[PDB]
Design a protein around this ligand. Structure first.
Ligand code: SF4
Ligand code: SF4
Lengths: 1016, 1016
């Protein structure tokens, strides 16, 4: 034999980069460290006066873009605030708490439903909202070092997944059918311009039931500025297409080529043609111009924003125009004038047209810039220059081209006046000049077509800023044309606002009234019709979710608000006879330590030393009667407890029955005996005690009752069997796990009661006991199949709840997930369950895990390029390897320019359920057939880990885990930090378990012969 | 009445509680604009007015962390192998290790590791231009949530250690001073008391040198860190802290003596017997221009070397004896340049009462040498940036500056910079500050460096690896050499030089050194705390060991674990030949017990791994070698047989003969029939455990411990059974039976073979700590003194101390290693020494271990305790934030005249005022607080109370009490400030969900308490 406890030489070399402890400080010269620094750099270099080449590169540059991994982390970080200030600062009043809650719970349909209910352009706004000036500007987490929440990127992700689902929008299912709709909803309605403002109005008017809505667009294309001028590298055009198709799912018609103009559409022709109401959303169609630039042409290199930006869009947004437009040749120095978000997008677009440098020249200072720093960041990092305090005076044209622009210095006084110093000039050499001063409405033929509505000092239509009504009651206006809004989201909200008051006007014109409280309908899809009801033990539940007997059911008044929120059923707090009344100590409910020092939302566990209800059985029985009177379709289960006393159990079970409880829950946490004949102290730990107690309750009541089991048993099957023999009609699995949540560093416990700082063993709830409760439910449902199981134990989403259903549970009680939140989580659970079952009917999404799409190769939540030279050549995303990636992409963006073909943006058509949408009964117990003994597991079918280096982020955790906890089977290249699984892999899967990039490591069938490591 | 319904007063308390919505909301765009300014938390892009910062030197760093923010960020760090952040740190700081220690709340271990490579670690963590250094190479850049705040984590851990008041000690590995070779008494001279010399002087003292002397020209120390770096980035008390640490090693500092020809010259040093010299005088003189000659401070002209010292002299208490005034800077201020210095002059100018600050540089924004950190502070303080401007003449009228005339610079075809004499800017200004850098121009200083070779930059030439000048005995480093730009690079230059200075001196005394540079680590009295412990007749050198699990798969892994410092180790469980097993794959999967958290810190793992696939021969030969090489490390052999007498005796004797210190009996073995619903495993029936313990106590003479299972009704029964059969102790506990979850389609994870089957696994990690903690406590109460080996979610010194306090002697670890690597042991051993050392410091009894008592903070920055801010209801948002900013600014003015800086504090280090406990002193001390529920006081009730200066207005306490409590909190609709009402019952749920550490506190109840009964 050799030395078994010493690594052989080639394993010694495997471990070369493995962490070892250190005995010394490490000598490294300040010089050497300077050159080694360049090998690992990830972020921009402060010594790079050089912008990498970006011509024809319209890839997503938004820093807010999120993948699933990133979006789940961020959603879990959000505090999900009451009266959340982020919503307060959202112009469309999105319930950001709710949709971010749905994202943490992996329910992206429910989040996207929340989003499009209040903003029909949620995916757009999620991408382009100046969140720092709006919702993120009010985020409570701004008061922490980690900072505010990326609200828009989360909203973009949840909306992106919903897009991929290809689910149509349906007509509001609360409405009557079209035939029995009152005549008023047949009113002919006209919208002018097909931008955000009108798309929002038409959608909200269709939601109300109006069945003849028409948007008249001037141009061959639709979407407004989101189509014509917002760059593709910030807003992909298929997003715009997607939100349009959603509105068209509601019957809104769009007619292009006809304009609001004299000798075209006028307010009068509309009135003559029978239109009962009109909304003006034509935007600001003309560019603000300077008399300095009179007579210049694009041939000389002059553009306005309204000239330049649509030219880049018509060429970089497939599906805009039948023309495969050529990108404009912009070779040289470019002067963009302006400081709104218009100018910054001509800046970044010029660099895409081949610009060699861009000067953003504005007439005021840096302090004075009108775009949000988000928009400014993308110009500054693409190395555009910034020239403040300069006003243009002459453009020098030589040889048919612009060759210079001469400015004068602008200045401020004491008065706050802005003058121009003639003596202080700047002759700035440039080849292209793009005025981006902004937009106006100046066309008389258009203003004339709006006769006789009133126009204000700014020659813009006056509107009641609360109803968006003009000086004619039947004509409304919103968005950029009003001069109030500066954003897509405020333009959307302007159409949202006008819709209800248009609905008010039209209904009044037909002799009908509307309610004094504006009620616009929510956003609906066929998912909302999925039947998530379930029957169990002879009781029908309207949804499988209910409140566990616990802190969220301390008072029955809280149960009423929960039923009012949508909860299917609820348990009373456990109550007993008067002689068994209790007093609680305090403190008695602490947060979990089970997942480290993470404070705030999503605690992984709680410990409680709380007893049963301090309130009386007289309170609970009268309460059960009141709640059953007002909520006949909401199951009310009274949880009860008595000593090991046949008279007591019989008397209390009879009283709770007479109160009208749909069922009973026998709390088996009551003691009897000393306690460890292998049977423990509590009744629920002894089979014979449980059999008798259930026998007694069976003799006493005629309603179904369930034994609530403790997990603190050697064999919970034996207890459940004992209840079934005793006559119970089901078991609730399980109560909390007996634990000690931890101690301070001085030895004292928490919770600590009184001056003595004493404690007792408490119960552990929450997701940290989910494997315990899931195991208990699985073994009961397999040992006693068909025996109804009410699952409790760390259920906090529709995805978790579905796992318990798959494991044999019929209904799902919740406690810790509400303590971590509030009662409204029920809405996320219900939409998440409707979504999960609906997706089971979609063939096209078979390659998904629930609401999660198949994780494609990505970096920073953006997909890595599928180029042949950029896959396989060992190129991690840092150091000199990243500069070569950026050169290969740039060259390949260039050969995709010198062949300007491929304009086939696929036509959107919805996915159709290919089998009946399963019911809750179609999934109960369907996972149990995969469970077995260990012998039923195949050791012939071994797997090995495989790593996707395009998704790897070079942390070497897999490397470390396999070395200090595995088989030393990963090589970690010392220059690229790229791991590679070798053939000594045993498939233990530990590396995958610790990889931070979702689906980077993958377990695949082993192809090379396997010999277990025996040592010998 | 109606009991299931809220009375009106409670209906009012619930006004802001969330409710599920049935309609989309109506809010006009105008109303949204007016409502947005009420919740705004961040700067408005519309406010151009600088906020008054006069005499405000409060911290303005965006990287400062408090404990709650630091703990989150250290947990988010992947703690990477071969970490690129460390390769980019000039001082090669082990970032992975010190951040791991922070994540485990071991702040001493982090600080010790930081100061081991960087004696100025607190300073560096505060001023580290991380984007161009360590954070520039961080892997988490490639994620959407971004690189790790390394400087903030360094600052926090270093700041906590600062507050501990623990001195640095001499290298304890050194011989006593008397027995030191005569060479170490060599007189060493260092010029300049800046970071370069402080580092070099510190590392020279660690090696053992006793006669070290720093010669500083001024009467202060610290170099630029004291003289020029502003107090709102680097406070002086930090510089004082680092100096006192160096002084702890005996380094001497003489102020007022200078390297100059009329004082200290190399000849005078050779004359006075000094045997080596280090030049760290930096660049003491400014880069001036001819444009400025004859311009005093009295005319409005400063250089950075003039202005910033006056401001530091005036804002850094204790830097000077002479109380100095804030320079009267009144009007427009031009700051010339764009280095790190220029932006400090701009920010310090606003502190002096500047009305307007213009930063003018001779190039563009793409050429700014300063870091994006630095630039942001001036940008967010409304400083104006003027590019492409070269100063040509200063206009002085009537004895003061009134304007500066500039010319427009531009880049040509070469890239060369030209001035355009024809394009001017007449910029009004009351003050000019040249920040063009620094030089060494003093000839008296240079002549004192004769005859060392100077280069074309007029700076000492040094071998960049040895820092040696042309004279062999003279070394140089820091800014004087010209390579360093940063404090950490100058620290590295001294670190570098100290080794080769060591070489030169030792050589000059006829002594050689190691060819491997080995600088000693940073040492405090904490490193001397004994953490050994004796148990069952065995001496453990520390209580931490590896559990029988994946980290002990091979003996070659146990060997590497011992080489890292692990006190003991269990072999993987091995068996006789006949019972050879074969694993399946996948078999180890990550836990879902804390939701979709990926990467570091998995709260649990689930495994279906069997015992070791390697033979008893391998493990027996391996134990022999391991114990022959590591006699002081305990090796316990884990063995398993079926329920069979001869087999248990054969295998236990074979492992004893191999030299095992002890045996661990794995009782996870199935027996025969099942019988009486009392588990299929041996460890679940106390009769079989007492028999197996009998049979092994038969075979062997060494101690043996029974590894107990937690999946039992009463673990104390199977523990007592072990103590009745043979056992010298018990290991509590093995893994918890569970199932970790299902994909949304029903298939499990792990999934074995094409059938996608699985079985019940074992749950490990921190999610079972409450179960393991409860088991160790019960066994310790029932069997006092019976040795317990603890297992179950030990992942830090703190968590291990909890198992020690609960009755355990040693601590087995598995999942924390799986989450990292073997070197966590060093974090554990440092943390345990710190936790025990601190128990002796009377000055820190108010701490929780290594966590200080939390004070009023926002973003981890002390709230100002001004009389006018408190008791007035001002949250940190909207108009309430401006009223606060107005209040601090009137107090920062009221503090300029109320002028006191003559009570500093002699930072005398804390001394142990009671013996440092040993492990034998803390075991079991938590058991006193444990007891039944009857032993808990229901008289000493508590109530919740909220510190509003700490609240971040999320409302979770409000929702948690509304939907999971007693509806006892008012949430004010205008301030979003909660207030706990008298109806509070002390349940403590609100404190448990609060994101802010210690914002809510449970206090004794003053008002009468009445249990809420609902009905009499
Ligand atoms: S560069 Fe400075 S802040 Fe960054 S890791 Fe090194 S010492 Fe710490
Ligand atoms: S949970 Fe904490 S931070 Fe949030 S409102 Fe309540 S007290 Fe304030």
């Amino acid at each position: 034999a050799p030395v078994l406890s010493k690594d052989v030489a080639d394993i010694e070399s495997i471990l070369a980069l493995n962490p070892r402890t250190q005995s010394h400080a490490a000598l490294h010269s300040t010089l050497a460290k300077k050159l080694d620094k360049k090998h690992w750099k990830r972020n921009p270099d402060k010594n790079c006066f050089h912008c990498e080449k970006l011509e024809n590169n319209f890839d997503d540059i938004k820093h807010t873009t999120l993948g699933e991994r990133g979006a789940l982390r961020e959603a879990m970080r959000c505090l999900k605030c009451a009266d959340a200030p982020c919503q307060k600062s959202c112009p469309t009043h999105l319930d950001i708490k709710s949709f971010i809650t749905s994202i943490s719970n992996k329910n992206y349909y429910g989040a996207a439903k929340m989003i499009f209910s209040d903003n029909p352009l949620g995916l757009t706004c999620g991408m382009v909202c100046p969140t720092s000036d709006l919702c993120v500007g009010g985020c409570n987490l701004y008061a922490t070092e980690e900072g505010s929440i990326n609200i828009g990127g989360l909203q973009q992700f949840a909306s992106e997944v919903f897009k991929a689902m290809n689910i149509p929008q349906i007509r509001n299912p609360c409405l009557p059918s079209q035939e029995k709709m009152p005549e008023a909803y047949s009113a002919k309605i006209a919208l002018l311009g097909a931008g955000p403002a009108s798309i929002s109005c038409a959608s909200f008017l269709a939601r109300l039931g109006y069945s003849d809505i028409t948007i008249f667009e001037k141009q061959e294309y639709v979407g407004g500025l989101s189509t014509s001028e917002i760059p593709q590298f910030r807003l992909p055009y298929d997003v715009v297409n997607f939100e349009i198709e959603l509105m068209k799912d509601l019957g809104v018609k769009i007619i292009c080529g006809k304009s609001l103009s004299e000798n075209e559409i006028t307010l009068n022709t509309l009135k003559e043609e029978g239109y009962k109401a009109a909304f003006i959303g034509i935007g600001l169609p003309e560019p603000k111009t300077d008399d300095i630039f009179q007579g210049l042409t694009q041939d000389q290199g002059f553009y306005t924003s309204k000239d330049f930006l649509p030219l880049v869009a018509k060429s970089s947004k497939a599906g805009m125009c039948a023309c495969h437009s050529p990108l404009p040749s912009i070779r040289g120095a470019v002067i963009v004038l302006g400081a709104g978000d218009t100018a910054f997008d001509c800046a970044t677009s010029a660099l895409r047209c081949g610009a060699r440098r861009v000067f953003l020249v504005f007439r005021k200072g840096f302090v004075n810039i009108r775009a949000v720093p988000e928009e400014v960041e993308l110009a500054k990092e693409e190395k555009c220059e910034f020239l403040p305090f300069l006003s243009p005076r002459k453009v020098i044209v030589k040889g048919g081209r612009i060759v210079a622009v001469q400015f004068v210095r602008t200045e401020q006084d004491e008065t706050g006046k802005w003058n121009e110093d003639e003596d202080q000039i700047v002759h700035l050499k440039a080849d292209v000049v793009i005025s981006a001063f902004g937009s106006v409405l100046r066309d008389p033929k258009v203003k004339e077509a709006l006769s006789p509505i009133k126009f204000n000092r700014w020659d813009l239509p006056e509107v009641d800023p609360e109803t968006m009504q003009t000086s004619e009651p039947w004509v409304f206006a919103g968005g950029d044309i009003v001069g109030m809004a500066n954003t897509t989201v405020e333009s959307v909200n302007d159409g949202k606002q006008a819709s209800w008051y248009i609905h008010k006007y039209i209904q009044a014109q037909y002799g009908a009234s509307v309610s004094a409280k504006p009620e616009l309908p929510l956003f609906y899809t066929p998912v909302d019709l999925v039947d998530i009801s379930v029957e169990m033990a002879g009781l029908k539940f309207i949804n499988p979710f209910g409140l566990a007997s616990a802190a969220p059911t301390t008072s029955s008044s809280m149960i009423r608000r929960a039923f009012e929120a949508g909860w299917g059923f609820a348990l009373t707090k456990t109550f007993s006879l008067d002689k068994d009344i209790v007093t609680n100590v305090s403190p008695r409910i602490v947060r979990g330590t089970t997942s480290g020092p993470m404070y705030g939302p999503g605690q992984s566990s709680f410990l409680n030393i709380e007893l049963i209800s301090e309130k009386t059985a007289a309170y609970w029985c009268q309460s059960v009667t009141e709640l059953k009177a007002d909520f006949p379709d909401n199951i009310v289960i009274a949880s009860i407890m008595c000593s090991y006393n046949k008279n007591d159990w019989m008397e209390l079970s009879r009283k709770a029955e007479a109160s009208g409880a749909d069922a009973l829950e026998l709390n088996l946490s009551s003691p009897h005996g000393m306690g460890e004949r292998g049977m423990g102290l509590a009744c629920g730990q002894d089979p014979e005690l449980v059999r008798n107690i259930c026998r007694w309750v069976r003799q006493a009541v005629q309603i179904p009752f369930f034994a609530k089991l403790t997990p603190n048993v050697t064999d919970i099957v034996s207890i459940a069997r004992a209840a079934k023999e005793g006559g119970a009609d089901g078991v609730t699995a399980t109560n909390t796990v007996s634990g000690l949540m931890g101690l301070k560093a001085d030895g004292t416990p928490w919770p600590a009661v009184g001056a003595g700082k004493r404690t007792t063993y408490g119960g552990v709830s929450g997701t940290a006991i989910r494997p315990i409760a899931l195991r208990a439910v699985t073994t009961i449902a397999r040992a006693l199949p068909g025996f109804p199981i009410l699952a409790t134990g760390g259920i906090d989403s529709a995805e978790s709840g579905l796992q318990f259903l798959h494991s044999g549970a019929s209904v799902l009680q919740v406690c810790s997930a509400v303590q971590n939140q509030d009662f409204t989580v029920i809405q996320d659970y219900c939409t998440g369950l409707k979504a999960l079952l609906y997706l089971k009917s979609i063939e096209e999404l078979q390659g998904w895990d629930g609401q999660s799409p198949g994780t494609e190769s990505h970096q920073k939540g953006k997909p890595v390029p599928r180029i042949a030279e950029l896959m396989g050549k060992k190129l991690p995303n840092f150091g000199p390897y990243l500069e070569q990636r950026k050169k290969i992409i740039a060259e390949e963006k260039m050969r995709l320019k010198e062949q300007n073909a491929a304009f086939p943006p696929l036509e959107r058509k919805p996915f159709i359920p290919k089998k009946p949408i399963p019911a809750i009964k179609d999934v109960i117990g369907k996972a149990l057939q995969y469970l077995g003994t260990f012998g039923e597991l195949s050791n012939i079918e071994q797997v090995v880990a495989v790593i996707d280096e395009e998704m790897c982020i070079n942390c070497g955790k897999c490397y470390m885990t396999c070395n200090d906890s595995g088989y030393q089977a990963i090589q970690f290249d010392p220059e690229t930090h790229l791991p590679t699984v070798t053939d000594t892999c045993t498939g233990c899967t530990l590396c995958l378990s610790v990889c931070p990039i979702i689906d980077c490591i993958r377990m695949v069938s082993r192809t090379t012969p396997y010999e277990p490591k025996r040592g010998l």
